[PDB]
Design a protein around this motif. Structure first.
Motif, PDB file in Angstrom:
ATOM      1  N   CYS A  79     -10.525   2.912  -7.411  1.00  0.00           N
ATOM      2  CA  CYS A  79      -9.995   3.632  -6.244  1.00  0.00           C
ATOM      3  C   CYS A  79      -8.719   4.113  -6.929  1.00  0.00           C
ATOM      4  O   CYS A  79      -7.500   3.922  -7.006  1.00  0.00           O
ATOM      5  CB  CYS A  79      -9.681   2.783  -5.061  1.00  0.00           C
TER       6      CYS A  79
ATOM      7  N   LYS B  39     -17.786   7.153  -9.807  1.00  0.00           N
ATOM      8  CA  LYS B  39     -17.204   5.718  -9.661  1.00  0.00           C
ATOM      9  C   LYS B  39     -18.046   4.888  -9.476  1.00  0.00           C
ATOM     10  O   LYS B  39     -18.046   3.673  -9.769  1.00  0.00           O
ATOM     11  CB  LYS B  39     -15.823   5.585  -8.899  1.00  0.00           C
TER      12      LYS B  39
ATOM     13  N   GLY C 242     -15.269 -10.027   6.148  1.00  0.00           N
ATOM     14  CA  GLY C 242     -14.155  -9.180   6.074  1.00  0.00           C
ATOM     15  C   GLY C 242     -14.378  -7.524   5.409  1.00  0.00           C
ATOM     16  O   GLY C 242     -13.594  -6.893   5.496  1.00  0.00           O
ATOM     17  N   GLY C 243     -15.294  -7.778   4.628  1.00  0.00           N
ATOM     18  CA  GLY C 243     -15.674  -6.481   3.821  1.00  0.00           C
ATOM     19  C   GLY C 243     -14.892  -6.229   2.783  1.00  0.00           C
ATOM     20  O   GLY C 243     -14.096  -6.695   2.260  1.00  0.00           O
ATOM     21  N   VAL C 244     -15.183  -5.291   2.068  1.00  0.00           N
ATOM     22  CA  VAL C 244     -14.707  -5.050   0.420  1.00  0.00           C
ATOM     23  C   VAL C 244     -12.976  -4.641   0.884  1.00  0.00           C
ATOM     24  O   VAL C 244     -12.207  -4.737   0.046  1.00  0.00           O
ATOM     25  CB  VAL C 244     -15.042  -3.865  -0.112  1.00  0.00           C
ATOM     26  N   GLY C 245     -12.559  -4.310   1.977  1.00  0.00           N
ATOM     27  CA  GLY C 245     -11.334  -4.116   2.166  1.00  0.00           C
ATOM     28  C   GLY C 245     -10.370  -5.408   2.182  1.00  0.00           C
ATOM     29  O   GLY C 245      -9.125  -5.356   2.292  1.00  0.00           O
TER      30      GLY C 245
ATOM     31  N   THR D 147      -3.622  -5.102  -3.191  1.00  0.00           N
ATOM     32  CA  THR D 147      -2.262  -4.660  -2.596  1.00  0.00           C
ATOM     33  C   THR D 147      -1.064  -5.132  -2.286  1.00  0.00           C
ATOM     34  O   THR D 147      -0.142  -4.816  -2.071  1.00  0.00           O
ATOM     35  CB  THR D 147      -2.640  -3.373  -1.753  1.00  0.00           C
TER      36      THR D 147
ATOM     37  N   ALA E  44      -6.710  -2.697  10.227  1.00  0.00           N
ATOM     38  CA  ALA E  44      -7.309  -2.878   8.696  1.00  0.00           C
ATOM     39  C   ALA E  44      -8.762  -2.623   8.685  1.00  0.00           C
ATOM     40  O   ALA E  44      -9.540  -3.246   9.601  1.00  0.00           O
ATOM     41  CB  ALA E  44      -7.173  -4.482   8.627  1.00  0.00           C
ATOM     42  N   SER E  45      -8.816  -1.806   7.793  1.00  0.00           N
ATOM     43  CA  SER E  45     -10.415  -1.155   7.500  1.00  0.00           C
ATOM     44  C   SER E  45     -10.940  -2.314   6.731  1.00  0.00           C
ATOM     45  O   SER E  45     -10.592  -3.206   5.976  1.00  0.00           O
ATOM     46  CB  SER E  45     -10.319   0.175   6.737  1.00  0.00           C
ATOM     47  N   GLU E  46     -12.244  -2.028   6.617  1.00  0.00           N
ATOM     48  CA  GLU E  46     -13.042  -2.958   6.046  1.00  0.00           C
ATOM     49  C   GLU E  46     -13.686  -2.425   4.910  1.00  0.00           C
ATOM     50  O   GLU E  46     -14.386  -2.993   3.856  1.00  0.00           O
ATOM     51  CB  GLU E  46     -14.447  -3.447   7.026  1.00  0.00           C
ATOM     52  N   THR E  47     -13.435  -1.106   4.550  1.00  0.00           N
ATOM     53  CA  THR E  47     -13.801  -0.408   3.564  1.00  0.00           C
ATOM     54  C   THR E  47     -12.845  -0.014   2.844  1.00  0.00           C
ATOM     55  O   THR E  47     -11.560  -0.572   2.847  1.00  0.00           O
ATOM     56  CB  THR E  47     -14.729   0.721   3.786  1.00  0.00           C
ATOM     57  N   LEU E  48     -12.910   1.019   1.748  1.00  0.00           N
ATOM     58  CA  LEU E  48     -12.140   1.555   0.678  1.00  0.00           C
ATOM     59  C   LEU E  48     -10.866   2.457   1.257  1.00  0.00           C
ATOM     60  O   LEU E  48     -11.013   2.798   2.437  1.00  0.00           O
ATOM     61  CB  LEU E  48     -12.667   2.211  -0.361  1.00  0.00           C
ATOM     62  N   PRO E  49      -9.575   2.384   0.660  1.00  0.00           N
ATOM     63  CA  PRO E  49      -8.684   3.123   1.154  1.00  0.00           C
ATOM     64  C   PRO E  49      -8.821   4.627   1.622  1.00  0.00           C
ATOM     65  O   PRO E  49      -9.569   5.264   1.253  1.00  0.00           O
ATOM     66  CB  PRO E  49      -7.660   3.135  -0.001  1.00  0.00           C
TER      67      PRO E  49
ATOM     68  N   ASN F 198     -17.510  12.254  -4.336  1.00  0.00           N
ATOM     69  CA  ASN F 198     -16.477  11.418  -4.777  1.00  0.00           C
ATOM     70  C   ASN F 198     -15.562  11.268  -3.846  1.00  0.00           C
ATOM     71  O   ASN F 198     -15.808  11.917  -2.425  1.00  0.00           O
ATOM     72  CB  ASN F 198     -15.898  12.373  -6.000  1.00  0.00           C
ATOM     73  N   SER F 199     -14.391  10.863  -3.775  1.00  0.00           N
ATOM     74  CA  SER F 199     -13.263  10.552  -2.825  1.00  0.00           C
ATOM     75  C   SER F 199     -12.858  11.879  -2.252  1.00  0.00           C
ATOM     76  O   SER F 199     -12.482  12.694  -2.998  1.00  0.00           O
ATOM     77  CB  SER F 199     -11.913   9.897  -3.470  1.00  0.00           C
TER      78      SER F 199
ATOM     79  N   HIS G 217      -2.770   2.540   1.230  1.00  0.00           N
ATOM     80  CA  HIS G 217      -3.835   2.090   0.127  1.00  0.00           C
ATOM     81  C   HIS G 217      -4.431   0.706   0.429  1.00  0.00           C
ATOM     82  O   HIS G 217      -5.397   0.275  -0.250  1.00  0.00           O
ATOM     83  CB  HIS G 217      -3.058   1.918  -1.399  1.00  0.00           C
ATOM     84  N   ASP G 218      -3.760  -0.002   1.271  1.00  0.00           N
ATOM     85  CA  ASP G 218      -4.155  -1.506   1.354  1.00  0.00           C
ATOM     86  C   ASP G 218      -5.285  -1.494   2.574  1.00  0.00           C
ATOM     87  O   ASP G 218      -5.407  -2.409   3.512  1.00  0.00           O
ATOM     88  CB  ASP G 218      -3.126  -2.205   1.806  1.00  0.00           C
ATOM     89  N   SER G 219      -5.791  -0.382   2.547  1.00  0.00           N
ATOM     90  CA  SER G 219      -6.982   0.229   3.512  1.00  0.00           C
ATOM     91  C   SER G 219      -6.501  -0.135   4.890  1.00  0.00           C
ATOM     92  O   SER G 219      -7.311  -0.672   5.721  1.00  0.00           O
ATOM     93  CB  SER G 219      -8.307  -0.609   3.477  1.00  0.00           C
TER      94      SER G 219
ATOM     95  N   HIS H 258     -11.585   7.012  -0.197  1.00  0.00           N
ATOM     96  CA  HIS H 258     -12.536   6.773  -1.189  1.00  0.00           C
ATOM     97  C   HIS H 258     -13.802   6.184  -0.798  1.00  0.00           C
ATOM     98  O   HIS H 258     -14.675   6.384  -1.734  1.00  0.00           O
ATOM     99  CB  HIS H 258     -11.551   5.434  -1.825  1.00  0.00           C
TER     100      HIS H 258
ATOM    101  N   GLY I  22       0.707  -1.074   0.226  1.00  0.00           N
ATOM    102  CA  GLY I  22      -0.023  -0.256  -0.127  1.00  0.00           C
ATOM    103  C   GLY I  22       0.466   1.384  -0.023  1.00  0.00           C
ATOM    104  O   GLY I  22       1.627   1.475   0.721  1.00  0.00           O
TER     105      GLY I  22
ATOM    106  N   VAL J 202      -9.366  -5.436  -1.264  1.00  0.00           N
ATOM    107  CA  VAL J 202      -8.407  -4.595  -1.611  1.00  0.00           C
ATOM    108  C   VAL J 202      -7.276  -4.932  -1.106  1.00  0.00           C
ATOM    109  O   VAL J 202      -6.097  -4.903  -1.659  1.00  0.00           O
ATOM    110  CB  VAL J 202      -8.655  -3.014  -0.454  1.00  0.00           C
ATOM    111  N   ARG J 203      -7.051  -5.489   0.080  1.00  0.00           N
ATOM    112  CA  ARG J 203      -5.862  -6.149   0.501  1.00  0.00           C
ATOM    113  C   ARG J 203      -5.210  -7.422  -0.019  1.00  0.00           C
ATOM    114  O   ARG J 203      -4.187  -7.958  -0.139  1.00  0.00           O
ATOM    115  CB  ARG J 203      -5.889  -6.551   2.069  1.00  0.00           C
TER     116      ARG J 203
ATOM    117  N   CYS K 244     -15.557   8.195   0.655  1.00  0.00           N
ATOM    118  CA  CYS K 244     -16.441   9.616   0.723  1.00  0.00           C
ATOM    119  C   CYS K 244     -16.811  10.022   2.127  1.00  0.00           C
ATOM    120  O   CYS K 244     -17.336  11.431   2.044  1.00  0.00           O
ATOM    121  CB  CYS K 244     -17.403   9.617  -0.333  1.00  0.00           C
TER     122      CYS K 244
END
Ligand SMILES: Nc1ncnc2c1ncn2[C@@H]1O[C@H](COP(=O)(O)OP(=O)(O)OP(=O)(O)O)[C@@H](O)[C@H]1O
Ligand SMILES: Nc1ncnc2c1ncn2[C@@H]1O[C@H](COP(=O)(O)OP(=O)(O)OP(=O)(O)O)[C@@H](O)[C@H]1O
Ligand SMILES: [Mg+2]
Lengths: 197, 341, 135, 173, 397, 280, 167
Positions: free
Chosen positions: G20, G127, C120-123, C130, B240-245, B296-297, B221-223, B262, B202, C126-127, B264
């Motif tokens: 993203c 997006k 685990g979610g969408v992340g 990455t 570690a997030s469960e969503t977007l970066p 948007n982001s 970036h690896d959330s 991301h 990331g 993502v992991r 938002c």
């Protein structure tokens, strides 16, 4: 005391200067500058379906060139982008309202500076010419020249031109100086100027 | 509170000292300065000098000077002369695009990260009357995405595309002098690498130093969100997030971070100094086709007032062209189950 | 002279900082109905660092084998018994599965993906994208 | 383009900024006596069918304004002439039409007020007024002859056709 | 050039001219229309007619795919081509090279849509999309002895008139100019003049009568008043008669044909007679365009002004244009010697017999030569290099 | 238009105009026309020796000699009588019309001139329909190379005539679209049991030892004509249909790709409206 | 089906993660800006390629990077007729890639169609709506390829009867 690559509208020059004055000897000239590219763009734009007359639209294509043309880094790469994707396409509005689209010709036109035969000119290309201009110069002053090449002129503003020369000079060196020693390439210090003003 | 300055992205923003004006880059080669009149926004300035998209904007509070860097490799230092801002060219000596810039808290120098895989530290010499810079190169292997100064104007945190968060010493002796020992270390010669994260994934989109600078945080970036404090041997906490970066982050107290990216919407992260653990008590933006204010982001976040020690208001500009002011207390009233610190 | 990619020798290029479960244990639980235990057993010690594309697949097969033995309604339970880092490693394995379609496996992996995604979610995805060191 | 008058002389008098041209007529008016066998009213009638189609017209001499006036007047005659039966009835119809008091330069109703100067004083007014009525009389008369085929009661369809058309998209009505 | 001659098709706004190369005249000249019914199941797409057979059709709706030379409906243009080939030309598309024409300033994308149709649908071995102006110049080689592809082409068809400068086979796009007056406007103007004077003309036949009058009696005169006077004088030698049949009652209706004979074409030189928004005399527009072109090619242009199209067939049209254009030029070169000795300007408007189908004719002629099969893009090249190859068509001849 | 027409419009119209003006006593115009037809057919309409009172219509078929071995000459003579004259150089059949000697009703001769091509083919079909109608079995099959790389095979049996086409699909996908149509012909008799039976065979020729061409782009259609089809009453119509079959098949394959396009134009247009809807 | 919705849901989520992107000036070339997933001249800027497969035929390949995403789809082709109908439809759109701006002029080898979404697209198009399109696209091509197939068949039948009933 470095070499100047000055390419304007009429002609392109490679001038080596030492501690104060230009050495008329060694200096060279390429019969391919700003105008030649503009005219070459017109040829490329006709093959695409746009009705451009060389004498009536010269000023128009020149602005297209200045706003959209650039120097490819790795042509094989630039080519794949143009043929496989549409990321290179840009829309330009002509004096009459008609909107044309320009893609691969954005880098093809300036590629002439490096490949003169494209516009049917016998030569080697400003890059290879820059290599031969210094490889002939004194063996003591060389290293210094190679690290003081400054770009001058209106036709030297193409995005990525500096990076192209550097990749070219490096390519020649690896073959015409290091014979092919990939491990020695790292010692070839090449610093191409290109200042704002 | 949301306001749309445009529908194209807002690459970056910066507010003046009193938070009276804000400078943004509307996906241009330009910088527009806006000012509030009653409850409306009026454009009062246009800074046109860059020849490429402006990627970073910073506003020195007291000297009221604006610094900008762009993809055209340039960096300009804007000074106000009457009713017009005049630019002074600063040569970063880089051959790729400049990606971010920040004034040191002491306002005697600024740092610019770039695609050249280096950080240009600039300061002015009142002898030859111009700006010069020194490079922090090793061991940056890729593009530097974000920067953030330490309260001592010497230490510098940088996030890059080689997946690393780093803290270097940006010690210039000709404008300041001998940094007092810090928990990050006692020896701080120019360019010295003080700390480097260990993650190998990331891109580090954003980095930030806490109010006292004993802790630094970054979002990759690896959330994941991260924090490392020098008071615990530079131990790093990871979540570690469960969503977007996430793309931007800041401390709002010594133990609280507010980030966005991301998804938002801004989120809340708290740090347990004792357990050395990070937690998610997030989602501050609670209810096109999204339920967040930004469409948007969110790519930048800044403390509006209350500092990083006790933040009361923060700002978020994003790729939707929007700017959002958030009230830390209003968020606590609306969400009764929310923490902070 | 242009056929040579000088960039391949540029000293600004990038270089990354450069194992497997246990069959006997996994097969043990499998031929015992202890599915949830089979999963964790397989999810242990991923060849994340071994160069051998062989040992990697050796592990991916064992994991895939467990995911197959599983009964549709027994997934959510064994998905919710893993710590977020496990769901992550699972997701990486599910995607490696998608690369080797075979029978209804590619259809069952889709059920897992659905479970792992809720856990685990969408992340967790993502992991997967990455990761530089991966299964 | 459109056709202009060639009757403008350096010794030609003016009324307002119209040319006080000579006219072969048994009607009274400030009109000078005529020498040549063709007057301003002959041109107007000669060029009519052609000029009527033009929308734009450049003024070159004060003579063109008199030409323009007569041309626009013909359009008024034809409107009348169209609906009557017999050259005779039409001659009476034209005395009445030429006797009606049309709008002169300067008054609302007169089109082209931006092109025609109004009488400077009360005397000009009386003269200009008398001159224009003169032309209306000596124009609707001759016109009466051209319009009716030797087969009376027949307003030539070769004239009635121009009834809906307007010179310069202007009208004296 | 093999056993079978190439197919030649000039799709216009009003009429499509089609036939085989080598012939002096189109084998078919049909209205550019297709009549259709109005989710398509079965073969309802095939249920259609074109040309005359489609102009009236009781249970079918007439559609016109081409507006001002440009293709507005590709679905319909493609079907139109289905019958042009298999019904009229009766040509096995896979055996003939095809030469299609295009409006001036047709976009590169349109050429691709056209090529997609000809190669994907009909499987043509070779295709060439010609620029009408070029073919017109070629048709003029017929005469009025030294061939050349540099000149001014005045193409007046049914849509809009074009003044197209051509230098050595290449149109000078940035200098093309239009004129809001064409064949349909002259017809429409004549219709009004007739409604204002002749009784008995069947309402639902108002235009049809006007058109016949336009094509059988019109002409361009040298001077308006003099022409008007002639009629009013020697009426018996100028007024003409026309008789038609009432589509209903089938009763014979007759009218007199007068001024419209010369007033109709007259609008080319005095647009303002029928158009409130345009007023430039065609002669000036020609002047204006040649003046905007590269100084050094201006003389070559003035010396070769070629005519093309149905609406250029009016008697003395070229005579009136030449004279008028000469006056404007000559007058302009007068203010120079006065203001200050510029060499005189030789203005020449070329009229030849093939004019009406100038474009198709030039096309038929060029497609008959060996060079034609060398400049066409083959199907193979089409598949291997892509539709892009059809964006450019080597000028030749 | 589903069925291809049998007559040639250029011939009929060219003649119609010439006869019309001759009938009105007008000075004859010179006429010179070169044009084609399906199956590599070439035509020429001209004035022999520049004599404008005479109009000749010639047709060239690279495989005429083959039809000639099956009664073409005898048949053409029956049909055109004295209009038939010595073949123009480069052609096989020439018809001559004297603008100064035409019949009261020109429609019949014009109609017939229109069917010049069809009349040249008619012959090989009438021959074998008769072989069957009489019982003459064992007669050598006729072989007509109507195209450079395509062939028709006619054969008569105790009670059925069989016409077989060796057709080719240049486009690899046209073969595929081709099978769809052939598949429907193969099942045609489900909608009409009396109708001819159609057979299909891809790549491989029906069994019916010849220079039979084999390939991924060659198919073999087979129509089995019964007495109700070959008898003197239905004979002519049967011929009007069967000799156009091959061009009828490729015509529809091509009209299908044209319809697909209208669909592709419609979906594509849709997608584009959606993407633009995604813009702020 | 039973397996359709699962497949598309798995593809939608993966697109959510990949789309993203941010503007990224070139690290290799002065003043250039290219889609990293295409040029691939910077290893660190490329993400891990991934595949979502419904079965042995239908699958999706998602290649993300810092500023661009390339998405390749292997469309369902039950038989010969569907195979050529698909090929013609995919070619028909690729020829028009400029109007799509997010379509690739050619498919990644092994796939029937490919998209190339850049930061510039995600900047001027929500997006999430783009993630929606790719899924909407996937659903609508299978449908179209179905109507064409039925249209071709429906017309073959009429053309055969039309001809045979005239004898
Ligand atoms: N942004 C640009 N990118 C590429 N070319 C440009 C650009 N701007 C100007 N040019 C070209 O540079 C040329 C003009 O440059 P310049 O004025 O330096 O030359 P000059 O000094 O007038 O001529 P010379 O150098 O031959 O004596 C023209 O060809 C112009 O089109
Ligand atoms: N003898 C004639 N005199 C005047 N006009 C004629 C004559 N013959 C035909 N026309 C007119 O020519 C026009 C059609 O000409 P043409 O076929 O060249 O136009 P087009 O090519 O269909 O249209 P476009 O060139 O604008 O695409 C019609 O208005 C027709 O009435
Ligand atoms: Mg035309």
């Amino acid at each position: 005391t470095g070499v100047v690559v000055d390419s304007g509208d009429g002609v392109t020059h490679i001038c080596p200067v030492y501690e104060g004055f230009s050495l008329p000897h060694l200096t060279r000239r390429l019969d391919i500058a700003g105008r030649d590219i503009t005219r070459y763009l017109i040829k490329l734009l006709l093959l695409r379906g746009y009705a451009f007359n060389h004498s009536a639209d010269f000023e128009t294509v020149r602005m297209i060139k200045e706003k959209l043309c650039y120097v490819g880094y790795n042509i094989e790469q630039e080519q794949k982008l143009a043929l496989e994707t549409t990321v290179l396409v840009e829309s330009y509005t002509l004096p009459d309202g008609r909107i044309i689209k320009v893609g691969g010709e954005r880098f093809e036109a300036p590629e002439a500076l490096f490949q003169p035969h494209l516009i049917n000119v016998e030569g080697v290309g400003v890059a290879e010419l820059l290599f031969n201009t210094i490889q002939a110069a004194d063996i003591d002053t060389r290293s210094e020249f190679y690290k003081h090449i400054v770009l001058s002129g209106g036709s030297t503003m193409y995005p990525g031109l500096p990076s192209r020369l550097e990749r070219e000079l490096k390519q020649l060196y690896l073959e015409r100086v290091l014979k092919g020693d990939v491990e020695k390439l790292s010692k070839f210090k090449i610093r191409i100027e290109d200042p704002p003003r | 509170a949301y306001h749309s300055f445009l529908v194209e992205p807002i690459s970056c923003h910066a507010w003046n000292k009193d938070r009276t004006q804000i400078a943004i880059c509307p996906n241009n080669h330009e910088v527009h300065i806006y000012e509030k009149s009653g409850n409306k926004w009026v454009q009062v300035h246009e800074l046109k000098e860059h020849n490429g998209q402006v990627t970073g904007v910073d506003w020195a509070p007291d000297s009221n000077r604006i610094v900008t860097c762009g993809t055209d490799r340039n960096a300009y230092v804007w000074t106000l002369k009457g009713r017009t801002w005049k630019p002074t060219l600063v040569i970063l000596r880089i051959n790729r695009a400049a990606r971010c810039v920040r004034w040191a808290p002491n306002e005697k120098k600024f740092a610019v990260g770039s695609g050249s895989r280096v950080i240009s530290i600039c300061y002015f010499e009142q002898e030859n009357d111009w700006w010069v810079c020194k490079h922090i190169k090793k061991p940056i292997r890729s593009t530097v995405l974000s920067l953030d100064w330490h309260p001592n104007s010497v230490l510098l945190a940088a996030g890059s595309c080689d997946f690393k968060c780093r803290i270097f010493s940006a010690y210039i002796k000709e404008v300041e002098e001998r940094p007092a020992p810090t928990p990050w270390g006692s020896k701080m010669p120019f360019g010295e690498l003080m700390f480097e994260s260990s993650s190998s994934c990331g891109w580090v989109h954003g980095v930030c130093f806490s109010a006292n600078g004993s802790r630094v945080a970054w979002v990759s970036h690896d959330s994941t969100v991260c924090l490392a404090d020098a008071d615990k041997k530079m131990a790093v906490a990871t979540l570690a997030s469960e969503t977007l970066p996430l793309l931007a982050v800041t401390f709002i107290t010594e133990s609280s971070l507010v980030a966005a990216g991301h998804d938002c919407f801004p989120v809340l992260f708290t740090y347990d100094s004792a357990a050395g653990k990070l937690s998610f008590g997030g989602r501050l933006d609670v209810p096109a086709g999204l339920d967040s204010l930004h469409k948007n982001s969110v790519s930048q976040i800044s403390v509006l007032s209350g500092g990083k020690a006790k933040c009361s208001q923060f700002c978020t500009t994003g790729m939707d062209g929007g700017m959002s002011i958030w009230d830390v207390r209003s968020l606590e009233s609306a969400l009764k189950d929310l923490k902070i610190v | 002279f242009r056929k040579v990619d000088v960039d391949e020798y540029d000293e600004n290029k990038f270089v990354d900082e450069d194992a497997g479960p246990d069959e006997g244990e996994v097969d043990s639980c499998l031929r015992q109905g202890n599915m949830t235990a089979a999963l964790q057993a397989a999810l242990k010690n991923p060849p994340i660092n071994t160069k051998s594309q062989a040992v990697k697949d050796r592990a991916g097969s064992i994991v895939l084998k467990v995911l197959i033995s599983f009964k549709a309604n027994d997934i959510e339970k064994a998905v919710q018994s893993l710590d977020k880092n496990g769901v992550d490693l699972l997701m990486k394995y599910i995607y490696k599965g998608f690369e080797s379609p075979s029978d209804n496996s590619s259809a069952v992996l889709l059920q897992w993906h659905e479970k792992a995604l809720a856990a685990g979610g969408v992340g967790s995805i993502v992991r997967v994208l990455t990761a530089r060191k991966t299964v | 383009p459109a056709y202009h008058s060639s009757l403008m002389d350096p010794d030609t008098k003016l009324i307002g900024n119209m040319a006080l041209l000579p006219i072969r007529s048994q009607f009274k008016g400030p009109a000078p006596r005529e020498t040549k066998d063709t007057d301003i009213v002959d041109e107007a009638i000669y060029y009519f069918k052609a000029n009527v189609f033009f929308k734009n017209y450049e003024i070159k001499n004060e003579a063109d304004r008199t030409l323009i006036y007569i041309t626009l007047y013909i359009s008024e005659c034809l409107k009348k002439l169209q609906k009557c039966n017999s050259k005779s009835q039409g001659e009476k119809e034209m005395y009445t039409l030429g006797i009606t008091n049309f709008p002169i330069p300067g008054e609302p109703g007169f089109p082209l007020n931006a092109i025609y100067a109004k009488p400077a004083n009360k005397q000009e007014d009386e003269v200009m007024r008398a001159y224009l009525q003169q032309l209306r009389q000596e124009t609707g008369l001759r016109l009466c002859e051209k319009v009716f085929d030797p087969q009376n009661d027949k307003p030539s369809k070769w004239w009635t056709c121009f009834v809906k058309r307007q010179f310069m998209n202007k009208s004296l009505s | 050039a093999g056993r079978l001659p190439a197919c030649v098709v000039d799709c216009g706004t009003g009429y499509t001219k089609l036939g085989y190369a080598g012939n002096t005249e189109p084998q078919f000249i049909i209205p550019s229309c297709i009549a259709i019914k109005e989710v398509m199941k079965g073969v309802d797409d095939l249920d259609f007619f074109i040309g005359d057979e489609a102009i009236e059709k009781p249970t079918y709706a007439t559609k016109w795919p081409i507006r001002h030379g440009i293709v507005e409906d590709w679905d319909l243009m493609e079907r139109f081509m289905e019958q042009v080939i298999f019904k009229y030309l009766r040509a096995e598309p896979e055996d003939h090279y095809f030469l299609l024409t295009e409006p001036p300033l047709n976009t590169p994308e349109n050429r691709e849509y056209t090529a997609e149709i000809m190669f994907e649908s009909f499987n043509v071995p070779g295709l060439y999309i010609a620029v009408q102006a070029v073919l017109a110049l070629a048709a003029s080689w017929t005469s009025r002895g030294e061939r050349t592809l540099t000149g001014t082409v005045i193409d007046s068809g049914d849509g809009v008139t074009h003044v197209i400068p051509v230098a050595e086979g290449y149109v000078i796009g940035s200098c093309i100019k239009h004129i809001p007056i064409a064949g349909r406007d002259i017809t429409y103007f004549i219709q009004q003049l007739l409604r204002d004077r002749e009784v008995g003309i069947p309402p639902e036949q108002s235009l049809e009568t006007a058109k016949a009058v336009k094509e059988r009696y019109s002409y361009v005169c040298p001077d308006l008043v003099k022409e008007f006077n002639k009629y009013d004088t020697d009426g018996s030698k100028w007024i003409k008669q026309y008789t038609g049949i009432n589509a209903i009652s089938k009763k014979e209706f007759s009218i007199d044909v007068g001024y419209e004979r010369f007033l109709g074409p007259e609008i080319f030189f005095h647009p303002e007679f029928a158009n409130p928004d345009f007023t430039q005399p065609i002669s000036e527009v020609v002047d204006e365009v040649i003046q905007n072109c590269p100084i050094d090619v201006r003389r070559p242009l003035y010396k070769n002004i070629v005519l093309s199209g149905g609406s250029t067939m009016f008697r003395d049209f070229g005579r009136r244009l030449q004279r008028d254009l000469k006056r404007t030029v000559d007058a302009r070169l007068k203010l120079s010697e006065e203001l200050s000795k510029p060499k005189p300007i030789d203005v020449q408007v070329i009229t030849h017999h093939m004019q009406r189908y100038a474009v198709w004719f030039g096309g038929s002629m060029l497609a008959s030569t060996p060079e034609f099969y060398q400049v066409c893009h083959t199907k193979k090249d089409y598949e291997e290099i892509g539709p892009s190859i059809c964006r450019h068509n080597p000028v030749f001849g | 238009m589903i069925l291809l027409e049998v007559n040639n419009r250029i011939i009929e119209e060219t003649l119609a105009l010439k006869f019309e003006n001759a009938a009105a006593g007008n000075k004859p115009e010179a006429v010179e026309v070169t044009f084609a037809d399906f199956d590599g057919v070439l035509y020429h309409i001209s004035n022999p020796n520049g004599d404008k009172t005479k109009v000749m219509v010639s047709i060239s078929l690279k495989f005429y000699k083959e039809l000639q071995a099956h009664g073409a000459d005898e048949l053409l003579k029956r049909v055109y009588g004295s209009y038939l004259v010595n073949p123009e150089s480069g052609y096989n059949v020439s018809l001559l019309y004297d603008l100064e000697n035409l019949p009261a009703s020109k429609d019949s001769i014009v109609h017939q001139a229109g069917m010049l091509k069809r009349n040249c083919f008619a012959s090989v079909f009438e021959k074998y329909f008769q072989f069957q109608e009489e019982g003459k079995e064992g007669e050598n099959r006729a072989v007509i190379h109507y195209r450079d790389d395509e062939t028709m095979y006619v054969e008569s049996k105790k009670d059925r005539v069989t016409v077989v086409f060796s057709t080719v699909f240049k486009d690899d996908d046209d073969v595929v679209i081709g099978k769809v149509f052939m598949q429907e012909f193969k099942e045609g008799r489900r909608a009409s049991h009396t109708a001819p039976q159609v057979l299909f065979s891809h790549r491989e020729p029906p069994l019916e030892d010849t220079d039979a061409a084999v390939g991924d782009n060659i198919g073999y259609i087979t129509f089995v004509l019964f007495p109700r089809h070959t008898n003197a009453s239905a004979r002519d119509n049967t011929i009007n249909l069967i000799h156009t079959f091959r061009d009828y098949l490729h015509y529809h394959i091509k009209c299908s790709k044209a319809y697909i396009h209208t669909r592709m134009r419609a979906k594509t247009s849709d997608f584009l409206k959606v993407l633009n809807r995604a813009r702020p | 089906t039973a397996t359709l919705r699962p497949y598309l849901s798995a593809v939608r989520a993966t697109l959510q993660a990949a789309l993203c992107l941010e503007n990224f000036s070139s690290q290799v070339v002065e003043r250039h800006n290219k889609p990293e997933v295409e040029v691939r001249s910077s290893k660190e800027l490329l993400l891990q390629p991934v595949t979502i497969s419904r079965n042995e035929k239908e699958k999706v390949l998602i290649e993300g990077s810092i500023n661009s995403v390339r998405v390749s789809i292997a469309v369902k082709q039950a038989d010969e007729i569907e195979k050529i109908l698909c090929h013609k439809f995919m070619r028909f759109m690729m020829m028009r890639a400029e109007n799509f701006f997010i379509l690739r002029r050619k498919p990644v080898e092994g796939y029937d169609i490919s998209f190339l979404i850049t930061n510039f697209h995600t900047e001027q198009m929500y997006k999430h709506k783009l993630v929606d399109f790719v899924i909407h696209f996937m659903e609508e091509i299978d449908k179209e390829i179905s109507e064409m197939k039925l249209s071709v068949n429906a017309r073959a039948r009429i053309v055969a009867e039309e001809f045979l009933k005239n004898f």
